[PDB]
Amino acid sequence: RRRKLPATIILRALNYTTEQILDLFFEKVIFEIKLQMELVPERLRGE
Amino acid sequence: SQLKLLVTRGKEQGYLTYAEVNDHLDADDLMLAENTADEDAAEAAAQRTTDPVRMYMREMGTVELLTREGEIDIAKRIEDGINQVQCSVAEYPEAITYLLEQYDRVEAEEARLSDLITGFVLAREKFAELRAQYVVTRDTIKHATAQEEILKLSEVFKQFRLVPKQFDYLVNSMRVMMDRVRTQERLIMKLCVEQCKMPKKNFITLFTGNETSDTWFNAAIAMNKPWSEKLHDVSEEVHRALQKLQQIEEETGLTIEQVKDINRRMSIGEAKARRAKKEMVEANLRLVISIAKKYTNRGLQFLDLIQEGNIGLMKAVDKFEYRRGYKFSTYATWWIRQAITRSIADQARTIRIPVHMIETINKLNRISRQMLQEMGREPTPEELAERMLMPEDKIRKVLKIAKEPISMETPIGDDEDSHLGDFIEDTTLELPLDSATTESLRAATHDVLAGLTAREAKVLRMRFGIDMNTDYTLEEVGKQFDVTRERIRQIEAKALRKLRHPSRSEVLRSFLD
Amino acid sequence: EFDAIKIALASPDMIRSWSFGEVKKPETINYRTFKPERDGLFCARIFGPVKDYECLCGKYKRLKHRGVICEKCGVEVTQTKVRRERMGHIELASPTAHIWFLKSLPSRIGLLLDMPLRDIERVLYFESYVVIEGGMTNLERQQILTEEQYLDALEEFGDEFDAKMGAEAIQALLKSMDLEQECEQLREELNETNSETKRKKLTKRIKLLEAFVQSGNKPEWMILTVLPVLPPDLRPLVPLDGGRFATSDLNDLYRRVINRNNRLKRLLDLAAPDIIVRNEKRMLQEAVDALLDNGRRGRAITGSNKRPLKSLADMIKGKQGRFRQNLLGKRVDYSGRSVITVGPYLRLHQCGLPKKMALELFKPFIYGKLELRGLATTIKAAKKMVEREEAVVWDILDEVIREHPVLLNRAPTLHRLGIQAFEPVLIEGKAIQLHPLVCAAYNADFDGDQMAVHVPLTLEAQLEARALMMSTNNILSPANGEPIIVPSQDVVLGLYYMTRDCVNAKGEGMVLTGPKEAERLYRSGLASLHARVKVRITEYEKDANGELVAKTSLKDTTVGRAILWMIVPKGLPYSIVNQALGKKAISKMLNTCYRILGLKPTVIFADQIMYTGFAYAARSGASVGIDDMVIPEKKHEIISEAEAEVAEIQEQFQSGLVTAGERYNKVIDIWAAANDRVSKAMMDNLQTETVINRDGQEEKQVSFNSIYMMADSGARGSAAQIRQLAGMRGLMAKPDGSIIETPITANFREGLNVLQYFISTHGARKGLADTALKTANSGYLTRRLVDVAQDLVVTEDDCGTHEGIMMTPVIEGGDVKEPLRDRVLGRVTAEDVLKPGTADILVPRNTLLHEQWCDLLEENSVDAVKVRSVVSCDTDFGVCAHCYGRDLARGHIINKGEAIGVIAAQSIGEPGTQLTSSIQVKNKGSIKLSNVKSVVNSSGKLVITSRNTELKLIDEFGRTKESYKVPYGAVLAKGDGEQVAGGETVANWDPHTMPVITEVSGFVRFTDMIDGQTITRQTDELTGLSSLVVLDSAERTAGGKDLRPALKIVDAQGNDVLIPGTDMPAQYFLPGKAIVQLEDGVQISSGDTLARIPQTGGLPRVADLFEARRPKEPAILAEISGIVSFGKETKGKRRLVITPVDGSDPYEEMIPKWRQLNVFEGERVERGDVISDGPEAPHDILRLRGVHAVTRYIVNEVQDVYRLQGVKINDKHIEVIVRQMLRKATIVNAGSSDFLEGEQVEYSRVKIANRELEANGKVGATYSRDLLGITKASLATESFISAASFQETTRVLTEAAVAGKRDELRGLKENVIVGRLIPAGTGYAYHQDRMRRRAA
Ligand SMILES: CCC[C@@H](C)[C@H]1CC[C@H]2[C@@H]3[C@H](O)C[C@@H]4C[C@H](O)CC[C@]4(C)[C@H]3C[C@H](O)[C@]12C
Ligand SMILES: CCC[C@@H](C)[C@H]1CC[C@H]2[C@@H]3[C@H](O)C[C@@H]4C[C@H](O)CC[C@]4(C)[C@H]3C[C@H](O)[C@]12C
Ligand SMILES: [Mg+2]
Ligand SMILES: [Zn+2]
Ligand SMILES: [Zn+2]
DSSP states (O other): OOSOOOTHHHHHHTSOOHHHHHHHHOOOOOOBOOOBOOOOTTTOSOO | OHHHHHHHHHHHHSOOOHHHHHHHOOHHHHHHHHHHHTOOOHHHHHOOOOOHHHHHHHHHHSOOOOOHHHHHHHHHHHHHHHHHHHHHHTTOHHHHHHHHHHHHHIIIIISOHHHHOOOBOOHHHHHHHHHHHHHHHHTTOOHHHHHHHHHHHHHHHHTBOOOHHHHHHHHHHHHHHHHHHHHHHHHHHIIIIITTOOOHHHHHHHHTTTOSSSTTTTGGGGSSSHHHHHTTTTHHHHHHHHHHHHHHHHHHOSOHHHHHHHHHHHHHHHHHHHHHHHHHHHHHHHHHHHHTTSOSSSSSOHHHHHHHHHHHHHHHHHTOOTTTOOOHHHHSHHHHHHHHHHHHHHSSSSSOOOHHHHHHHHHHHHHHHHHHHHHSSOOOHHHHHHHHTSOSSHHHHHHTSOOSOEETTOBOOSSSOOBGGGGOOOSSSOOHHHHHHHHHHHHHHHHHHTTSOHHHHHHHHHHTTSSSSSOOOHHHHHHHHTOOSSHHHHHHHHHHHHHHSTTTSSHHHHHHO | OOOOEEOOOOOHHHHHHHEEEEOOOOOOBOTTTOOBBSSSSSBHHHHOOSSTTOOSSSSSOSSSSOSOBOTTTOOBOSOGGGGGTOEEEEEEEEEEEOGGGTSSSSOHHHHHHTOOHHHHHHHHTTSEEEESSOOSSSOOSSOEEEHHHHHHHHTTOOSOOOEEOTHHHHHHHHHHOOHHHHHHHHHHHHHSOOOTTHHHHHHHHHHHHHHHHHHOOOGGGGEEEEEEEOOGGGSOEEEOSSSOEEEOHHHHHHHHHHHHHHHHHHHTTTTOOHHHHHHHHHHHHHHHHHHHSTTSSSOOOBOTTSSBOOOTGGGTSSTTSIIIIISSOOOOSSEEEEEEEOOTTOOTTEEEEEHHHHHHHTHHHHHHHHHHTTSOSSHHHHHHHHHHTOHHHHHHHHHHHTTOOEEEEOSSOOSGGGEEEEEEEEESSSSEEOOGGGHHHHTOOTTTOEEEEEOOOSHHHHHHHHHTSBTTTOOBOSSSSSBSOOOOSHHHHHHHHHSOOOSSOTTTTOEESSHHHHHHHHHTTSSOTTOEEEEEEEEEEOOSSSOOEEEEEEEEEEHHHHHHTTSSOTTSOSTTTSSOOOHHHHHHHHHHHHHHTOSHHHHHHHHHHHHHHHHHHHHHTOOOOSTTSOOOTTHHHHHHHHHHHHHHHHHHHHTTSSOHHHHHHHHHHHHHHHHHHHHHHHHHHHSEEEEOOSSSOOEEEEOOOHHHHHHHTTSSOOHHHHHHHHSOOBOOBOTTSOBOSSOBOOOSSSOOOHHHHHHHHHHHHHHHHHHHHHHHHHHHHHHHHHHHTSSOOBOOSOOOOOOOEEEOOEEOSSSEEEOHHHHHTTOBBSSOOBOTTSSSBSSOSSOBOOHHHHHHHHHHTOOOEEEOOGGGOOOSSSBOHHHHOBOSSSSSBOOTTOOHHHHHHHHHHGGGTTOOOEEOOOSSOEEEEESOOEEEOTTSSEEEOOSSOEEEEEOTTSOEEEEEEOOSSOEESSOTTSBOOTTOOOEEOOOSSOOOOOSOOBEEEEETOOTTTSEEEEEOTTTOOEEEEEOOTTTSOTTSTTOOOEEEEEOTTSOEEBOTTSOSBOOOOOOSSEEEOSOTTOOBOTTOOSBOOOOOOSHHHHHHHHTTOOOSSOOOBOSSSBEEEEOSOOBSBEEEEEEOSSSOOOOEEEEOTTSOOOSOTTSOBOTTOBSSOSOOOHHHHHHHSOHHHHHHHHHHHSHHHHHHTTOOOOTHHHHHHHHHHSOEEEEEEOTTSSOOSSOEEEHHHHHHHHHHHHHTTSOOOEEEEEOOOTTTSSTTOSOHHHHHHHSOHHHHHHHHHHTTOEEOOOSHHHHHHHTSOOSSSTTHHHHHHHHHHHHO
C-alpha cells in the first residue's frame, strides 16, 4: 500500500522481456505477401 | 503539476484517499500529507528529509577513509604542531621562574615530587641542574653575550617534560599577558585614530621599531597636524597606557615584535594540530557510529549515543601516539565504549542512579539470569545473596530501587480515555472541617482567656504565641512587666490551674478529644 | 478584578523577569533521600520549599521566622503552594526558532521575511548559507549560497561578506529588518502599476507590516534565546504506593532539552570540528521543537511505553485539554446520583429524596443547625452526632430541608428542561421518586435510568432555582407554545375509559341533580361509569371583564363525564369534558385552562387530572390477553388470491410477455394491495361490536376491546403495531435498500418460521445502527448551532423600526398546512392591520398578537400581516424585545437580558434524533390569476402568455384556499372575474416536447433560411410531409452558421406583419435541434407549434442548509434587468449578454450549453427572474433579492424537513440563526468614511459608522450584505478566548500573539472560562453597572 507503480515493472523485475509480456497477455494476427491475410472467422466478431 | 491534479480531485470530491495522494505525490511524505490537509490555501497550493540522523549521515558521507599510512602522516603533523609551540614558549622568561618557584614549594612538602613533573627526557638532580642554569643565566642579562646564555638555558629546559596541567597554565598565563598588552594597544589605537583620524602611516613609522619609549606618541604631539593637536585631550589615557606598556616591557624582556612573531608561529602550529585532528575525526566518525549501535534501547536516542561517541574519539585522537602501533580501531573503540556507557549511566533515567549502583544492578541481573537458566524456577533474595556475596539486605535494597516512573498519561480508564493522572489525590490539602475546627478553637480560646485578670491574659498570650507575632520567653515578658522571671512563672501557673478545673473550661475539653 | 486579558510575544528580558532562577542540571530528586536536587528541575531554591514554612535543611522550620532565606540551603521559608506559581528559565547556548511561528500554515516567519518556507527550513538545518546585508559587493540580501558557492564567493572578497547559517542567520535577518521603511516602499509600489494579484499582495504585505508595527512586538522575538520552565507542581513527580513513581511527560522533554544544551555548551569549549557542533545544534532545535509541540515537524518522540509524549501544546488543545475538559465542565461538590422510581403521590413541584442521600448532601447545614440550637458544643461533636445518626439529627435534617430546592438532571441534556428544581421530600430507600408528569420533559423511563442531584448553596442560587428553574414554572415548551406537562399513557387510558359512553348500561336514562349524585350512584353500585343520563350542570363564563357569570342547565351526558366535571376549574365550559377525551383532547383542555385562567389553576388542574386518571385506570382493570388480538376471518382468502395473481404474473413472464423490471413492480403492487385489504378487514372487525339494547334490537357501537382502547385513546400503540399483531407483518426490505417481493404473511399471534425471523433480524440490526448514528449527528449539529449564535441577548425594549416580515399561510399547491394563526401568534405587528374591506385599522401597531387578536383576525378573514422580525432589527450587539416577540415559555413579551441564541440552538437541535400535467380545483370559488398576460387563441379560449402565472381560488369570503402554478401557454376554460363551480378543470396543457408557440396568425415564409447551411432534408415518410430539421452549429457548414432560422409573418398583400401594439419585427430565432414541420407559405393560427424541440431529506438537509452550501446545478437568475442578448459562441460555454434599457451592460456570463434555457434572446427579463431551471442557491437570492427573501427561503425550506416528521418549532428560532448567518457586509463604495473599497466588515459597525457620519456634514458608504454558514460565521469571533475553545488552539493563539490582541470579556463563553457571571440572565445587571462605572 505504498506509492503506486505501473504493474508491468514487476514483470520486468521477474526477468521478462517485452515480447514475452505481449505473448503472455495478448493474442496475435499474421499477414502474408500480394498482401494476403489468413482469415479466422471467429475473431472478426465486429468488423 | 502533479500536486495540482490531486488538489483538483480533492476539491471536486472534498476528500481524498491515502492511495490517491501517495500515487499523485517518510518524513517528506508526512510533510506533504500535512500540507495537503491544509486546504481541508494559497500558501499550501504553492507549497530535505528533515530527519536529524539522515542529514548527519549525508554530511558525514562526503569523507574519505584513511589507510594504515594515511594516519602516520597526520600523526607526525600533530607532533610538529606541538613541538613548534614548545619552541614558541621556551623563550618566555617568566615560565622558568614560575617552574622553579613551584618546585621549591613542592620541596617545602606542599605536594608530591612526582605529581609536579612526569619525569624528564634523578628528578632532584635534574631540578638542581635547572636551578644552577637559571641562577647562572639570570645574573648575566648583559646584552652582548646574554642572548647565547638564554639560548643555552632554553635548550637545557627543552630536555624536561612538563605535566599537561601546568604547561597549559603557563600557556594561559602567557596568553592573558599578551591579551593585556593587546588590549592596551587597541585602546591606544582607538583613542588616537578614531578620535583624531591619526594616519596609519605615522603609527607604523613611530610605534614600530622601538615600541618602548614615549617618543612615538609624546614627541609626535608637536608634528604640526590636527591629529597631534587633538591628541592633547586624550593624552592622559594614552600616557597611562604607555606607562603600563613600559612596565610590561620589563617583565617581557624582549621586543614586542618578537612576541608577535612567536604568537604567530604558535597560532600556525595550533591550527595545524587542529586541522590534523579534524581530518582524523572526520574519518573516524564511521567507527563511532559503528560502535554505537549496540545501545539502541537503553534510554538514550541513537543520536545522543553518536554524539557521546564523538566526544570519546576527539579525546582519543588527542591521546593517540603511533609508537605503539595499535591500529586506531583498537585504541579508539575503548574510549568510545567508555564514553557511551558512562553517558548512559549518567543521563538515561529521570531519578539518577550513581555509576557503581548501576554496575551492581547489572551484575545482579546477570546473576539472576544465570540462576534462572541453571536451576530452572527462579532465584530468591537469600539465594541471590549466597551466589552474589552480599549481606542479603543490600540485595533487598537494590531490588527495592524505584525502577522507572510510570508515565502519568498511561491510558488506564479504557472507558473514557482516562489517564492515570486523574486518580492521584492531593494529600497535603487541609480538610474544610479541620479549618472550621481551628477557627472554632481560636474563638473558644479568645472567649475563655477573657475570663481572667488582664495580667494573666497578657502573660498567657505572651508565653504562647496566641495572636502575637512571635513567641516570647519569661525574661522578655518580665522586661515588659517590670518583674524578673519568677512572679511571671507563678502567675502563669495560677492561670493554668484556674483554667484547669471544669465550669470554666468545658468546651475546650470538647476540642481536646 | 482585571476586566481584560492581553496576549503578545515575550522578550528574553520578560522571560528572565518571570523566572526565579536558572535550571542548570537535568536532575530531579535524590534516589535515596527523595529530596529535591540543586539547580535541577525540582529545586527548592528556585521553586520554593516542599513543605509549609520549613527550610530544606531544617534549621528554620517555624512560622515565627518567615520570609528569611536560609543561608545553608537558600530556600525561602514560605508556603509550599508557591511551588505552583514560580517559573524558571534555561538560557539556550544558541538561538532556536519557535515552531509555532515557523511551521504555522501562513508561516509567520516566512511571511514577514518574504521567503519560501523551504529556504527557511534548509537554512535552519545547516544546509545553505544566507547573506545578511551583504552590501555593495554584488550580493542580494536573502540569497541562498550552498557550501561550495559560499566558499568560492569568500575568495576575491576581502570584505566580511556577511554570510551565516542556522537560526542565527534568521535572527540577524529579523533584527536587521526595518518595518516602517519597507512599509513606505510597499506604499510606493501600491501607488504605481497594479495587477490582478500584485495590488492584492502588496496591500496584504503593507497591512500585515502595519499590524506588526502597531502590536508593539519585535520580529526577532520569534527566535528563542531563553526558554521558560513550568512550575514543578504542574508537572509533578509523585510517589505511588510502594517504591514506584509517576511523572508527567514534560520532565522527560525538559531533561532532553537541558542535556543537549549542556552538551553543546561543553562542546563549544573543546573547539570540536564544525560537523559535530552543527549536528548538536540540529539536535537542540529538534528537542526544543519536541518540547513546545511534539509530533508536528518530523516524528513524535516516544517514551518507554512506546507512546508519543505529551508536549506543552498537547496540554491545551483537544477535547481533553484545559480549554474543554476542565474549564467548561468539571466535577462538582454537593452532588449525588441514583436510580429513579415513580412516586405517583407527589405534587408537581416536589420530588422524593432518600434520607441517606439528603443526610450526605446537606452535612454543613446540619452542623450549623446543631451548633446553633445548642445540641452540640463544637463542630466535632456535631460530626459525631451525625455519624451516629441520633434521633435529633433527623429532626434537624427535616428542618434544614424545609424550603430548599434541589436540581435534578438527566445525562442527555438536550434542552433546558433537562434540569429542573424540585422541593425534596425525605423518603426511605435508595431511589429518587420523580413526578410522572415531568418524565416527558426529561425523556425518562423507569426501566433503569439514573438522575443526578445538585443542591444550590447561596441565597441567590436558591432564589434562582425557586423563581427560574422550578418545575411549576416550566409547563410550556420553549420551542413552541404547547404544554409539555401532558398526561402520558395511563392517565390517558383512565380518563378515556371514564368518559366513554355505552349503549345500554346500568342506570341508563336517569336524571341526576349534579355531579355529586352521579358519583354517589356510581360508587354505591347503582349506575355504570358510562350510562347515558341527564345531569344538571352549573358552568361559569367570563362573558364580562372577568366576572364569571353562572348558567345552570340539564346536559345529556354520562356518569363518567359528570364525575370528571368535579375537578374542572370555574372558567371552563362543560363541552371540554363532554366527549371521549383521547390523548389530544386532554392537551387541548390543559391549554384552554392555561390561556383562560392562568398558571396556578393549570398546575392544580394537572395534578387532579393525574390523580383521577390513575385512580380510574386502576378501577377499570384493563388487561391484555391473547384473545384480544383478533385475526380476520378472510385473511387466508386474501393471501390465497394474492398468491394466485402473483403466480399468474410469474407464468406470464415465463412466456416472455413482460420484462422482469415490470413484473417485479406488478408483484410488489399485488402484495401491497393484499396487505391493505388485510389491514382494512382487521380494523373493521376490531373496531366495532354489536350490543343489545334499550328495546332488544341489535345495535353497533365502538369496541371496548383492550388493544383497540389502548390504540384509540393515544395511550400506547398505533394502527401499524396492531397491524403487525393481528394482520400481517408486512413487506420487509433488504441490505441493498431493495424491497423483497414476497412479504411476511404471518403476524405475532401466529408464529414466524425461521426464514421470516431471519428477515426480521435483517431489519432490526439496521434499525439499531441507524439510531446510534442519528444520535451521533444530532449532537454535532446542536454544538455548531450553539457556537454560532451563543452571544445573542435581548438588550433593548424597542428599536423603533418600521420594517418586518410579511406573514401569510403556507400552501403546497393544494391544501394549506399551516394557518396564519400558527405563524402570527405571539408576534408584534409592524404596520396597521387594515380590515380586508379597507375601512379602518383593525390592529393599530406594536401590539403583541395574543389569542384574542388572532381570533379577531380569523373572524375578519385576513390572510396577510406584517410582523416585526429579528433578522430586521436595528439594535446593535443584540436584539430588542419588540422585534423578537414573546417568550413562548412564560407567555408574555420576552424579558431584557434573556439569552435567545442558546434557546434557539437547543430548540432546533433537540428534535434532531426524531427526524429520519393537469390541474384540478377542489372547492366552489372564483378563479383569480396573478402575474399573467392573457390572449384569445384561435379556438376563442384564453391562453396564458406568461411564465409565472399563479391561479388562486378566492372563495366568497375573499380568502385564498388553493394556489396552483400553470406553465406557459395553457388553454383556460374560465378566467378572472367569473364565478366557477367545483370539479371544473380550468386549465390543461401538454407536459411534453417544448412549449415554443407563436403569437399571431398569417403567412409564414422561411426568411434567412438556406438548405444545407442550417437545416437537413428529412421528409416525414410516415405522413409524407416535408420537415426541415435544424441541425446544430457543429454539424452545419460555416456558410450560414452565423445565420439563424427566422420565420416572419406576412399577409397576402405582400406587406409585413409586425408584433401587434409595437413596431418590433416578428421574428423567432429558433435554436438548434428544432424540427420545422410546416412548409413556407402555409398560414399558421395563433400559438402554433413551429418546432417540436425535443428534451435530500432528514438531518443532512438541515445541516447542509444552515451551512449555505451551493447546490449541484444552481438555476441561473437574471443578474440585471434588460434585453437579453448573445455574443461570441461556443467559447467553451454559450455566452449571453443582458443590455439594460439605458444603463451600461458590463455583464456577460459563460452559460453552459448543456442547460436548457427557458428564455429566448428576443425576450426581455427583469432581475431576479430564472433563466435556467433547477435548485435555487441561498447566496443568489440574497444578492438579487433583499434579506427578507433569503430568510423566507430558509425558514420555509428547513421547516419542511420538520413538518414531515410531525416536529413543530417556532419560526422565531430559525430567524435567530439566520440573523447570525448574514452578519458580514462587503463594501462597494468607500464614500466619505474610512473604509477600504474591497473589505469585509461587521454589518453592525458599518451601519453605525455611516449613520453618525451622515448626521454630520459627510456622506455614508454603500455596501452589499453577505451570507455565510454557521461554521464559517463562527470563526469571525472577536475574542481569542471563546475562539480557542472550539477552533484550533494553535492557530488562534499564534495569530493573536503576533497581533498583540487584547479582548475584554463580553461573551457568555469567556466569562465561564474566567469564572465570573455571564452577561445574560441574572448577571445582566451586574455587567451593565460595571460598564457604567468603568466609563466614569
Ligand atoms: C491498560 C491500563 C494499564 C494499568 C491498569 C496498569 C499498567 C501498569 C500498572 C501499574 C504498574 O504496574 C506500576 C504499579 C505497580 C503496583 O504494583 C500497582 C500500581 C501500579 C501503578 C500498577 C496499577 C495498573 O495495573 C497499572 C497502571
Ligand atoms: C479499571 C480502572 C482501574 C482503576 C479504578 C484502579 C486500578 C489501579 C488504581 C491506581 C493504581 O493502583 C495506582 C495508584 C495506587 C494508589 O494507591 C491510588 C491511586 C492509583 C492511581 C490507583 C487509583 C485507581 O483505583 C486505579 C487507577
Ligand atoms: Mg431507559
Ligand atoms: Zn537551609
Ligand atoms: Zn429591533
